[PDB]
């Protein structure tokens with residue numbers, strides 16, 4: 001199996017229509033049961049987050065999710081778990097899903113199955129030490145980089161690879177654009193079956209999310225979890 005590195009990417013959504021990664025990604029993605037979209041036949045959105053480190057807003061993000069009773073899926077790294085045990089515990093205690101973003105956040109395509117297995121299981125090990133629980137296995141490739149070998153291998157390891165359909169620059173600390181920037185992206189890029197990828201490190205990301213959920217719901221959107229996405233497609 002091919003180990004050519006691939007960077008997950010796509011032309012952004014337009015006119016609130018789902019985006020498309022093209023035939024090559026779709027075919028490859030489908031081949032290993034990985035996806036970047038949920039059910040596009042309904043006004044549904046799935047919130048996911050990538051957490052590499054804490055910059056002080058995740059608690060507010062969690063309070064916001066609780067307020068709207070929405071279930072998030074947080075993809076954590078080894079450092080994040082080790083550094084924020086209590087946040088990992090709140091995510092757990094509050095009904096949220098904890099995804100895998102690898103322990104050291106390396107370029108998995110440069111790793112061996114032996115290494116990949118440790119990169120992933122060590123995150124679960126730490127999460128369990130803290131929660132005593134373990135979510136279904138979801139993986140988001142560190143740096144968004146992957147390959148057929150990586151997909152195949154991680155799938156062989158029982159992981160469901162989850163990409164995204166909505167993302168923007170809410171992770172540059174040296175240039176935190178404020179509430180409006182993120183809020184508008186979340187409104188403009190919204191489409192049915194959209195899988196959002198957000199970070200909780202930029203200034204006001206929590207308040208923009210708050211307003212975004214508030215308004216997206218007014219527009220008739222229902223927020224579902226990656227577990228819900230999985231269950232509903234099963235049937």
Ligand SMILES: CC(=O)N[C@@H]1[C@@H](O)[C@H](O)[C@@H](CO)O[C@@H]1O
Pocket residue numbers: 050051052053077141142143144171197199
């Ligand atoms: C912890 C963190 O910020 N993860 C990011 C991920 O969200 C993003 O898609 C990728 C490319 O920008 O780089 C990292 O993997």
